[PDB]
Amino acid sequence: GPSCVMDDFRDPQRWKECAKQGKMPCYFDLIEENVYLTERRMQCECTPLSKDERAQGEIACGEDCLNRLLMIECSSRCPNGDYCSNRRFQRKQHADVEVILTEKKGWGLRAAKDLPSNTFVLEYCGEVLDHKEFKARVKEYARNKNIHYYFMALKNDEIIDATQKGNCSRFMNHSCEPNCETQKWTVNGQLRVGFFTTKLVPSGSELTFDYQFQRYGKEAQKCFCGSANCRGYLGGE
Numbered sequence: 001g002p003s004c005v006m007d008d009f010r011d012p013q014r015w016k017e018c019a020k021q022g023k024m025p026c027y028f029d030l031i032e033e034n035v036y037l038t039e040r041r042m043q044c045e046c047t048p049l050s051k052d053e054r055a056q057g058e059i060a061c062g063e064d065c066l067n068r069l070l071m072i073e074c075s076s077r078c079p080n081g082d083y084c085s086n087r088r089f090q091r092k093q094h095a096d097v098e099v100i101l102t103e104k105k106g107w108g109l110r111a112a113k114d115l116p117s118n119t120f121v122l123e124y125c126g127e128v129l130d131h132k133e134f135k136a137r138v139k140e141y142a143r144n145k146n147i148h149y150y151f152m153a154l155k156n157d158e159i160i161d162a163t164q165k166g167n168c169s170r171f172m173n174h175s176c177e178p179n180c181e182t183q184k185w186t187v188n189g190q191l192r193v194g195f196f197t198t199k200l201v202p203s204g205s206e207l208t209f210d211y212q213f214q215r216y217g218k219e220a221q222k223c224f225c226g227s228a229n230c231r232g233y234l235g236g237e
């Protein structure tokens, strides 16, 4: 049914109005970068490309970049400088995606262009919690009878919670037969998580990933992904 584009989320007044008429998802605080609840050199050796090579369509810090090969982003001090193609998280080089209402899963993401395989979609941003804060929030959310949950594992004692604060990545739904994956990238010595396509995604297709997370509580949510190999429930490892 109703869809919306990512720029629609930049106007909180218009958003709150479209929301009241069921044309946009419920309001949340839109953020650019992870926020830590509790607060807590790496140069590559790529050969600076010439003016000539930039013009032909050559890639600066491409598949042989030693930073890229370790899922580390370069900094502003990269030998390719401005031209470095390995600062996707930092430069918000997100894929062209729209937010759409699904039949039974709530809102979702869909490709607005064809997206090649291994294309960066979006960073999963949110409030970064420790294990204690996370468990507190699970209990609070269960008490409030929330339907949608927004936790993503980042690393030991770091769980991203996009329930209150996040970005449009929070709309990506789980599928047992997905077309995207998470990848954890080191950006300024700190880990972030992003969604990347794992195959060619046709324009108009819903973007999905295989959500993996330790099981908590009782009454696990049912999966409506529609795959022949559906596990039937969301989460688990």
Ligand SMILES: Cc1ccc(F)c2cc(C(=O)Nc3cccc(N4CCC(N(C)C)CC4)c3)[nH]c12
Pocket (backbone or CB within 6 Å): 138, 142, 149, 150, 151, 152, 172, 173, 174, 211, 213, 216, 217, 218, 219, 220, 221, 234, 235
């Ligand atoms: C980032 C993302 C993408 C797609 C998903 F399906 C999910 C699901 C989650 C998620 O946080 N699930 C999550 C985490 C913690 C507790 C729970 N439970 C949800 C249902 C609760 N019962 C009492 C109804 C029991 C606690 C769910 N996070 C997702």
Ligand SMILES: C[S@@+](CC[C@H](N)C(=O)[O-])C[C@H]1O[C@@H](n2cnc3c(N)ncnc32)[C@H](O)[C@@H]1O
Pocket (backbone or CB within 6 Å): 025, 104, 105, 106, 107, 108, 147, 148, 149, 150, 151, 170, 171, 172, 173, 174, 175, 221, 222, 223, 224, 225, 234
């Ligand atoms: C991170 S959110 C995704 C965005 C959410 N659909 C919304 O409307 O805000 C995760 C929640 O979406 C729903 N969801 C995601 N994938 C699903 C699936 N395959 N089947 C059923 N519900 C799903 C569940 O309620 C889950 O807790």
Ligand SMILES: [Zn+2]
Pocket (backbone or CB within 6 Å): 044, 045, 046, 060, 061, 062, 065, 066, 067, 068, 074, 086
């Ligand atoms: Zn490089």
Ligand SMILES: [Zn+2]
Pocket (backbone or CB within 6 Å): 044, 046, 060, 061, 065, 074, 075, 078, 079, 080, 084, 085, 086
């Ligand atoms: Zn670089």
Ligand SMILES: [Zn+2]
Pocket (backbone or CB within 6 Å): 175, 176, 177, 223, 224, 225, 226, 227, 229, 230, 231, 232, 233
């Ligand atoms: Zn499923």
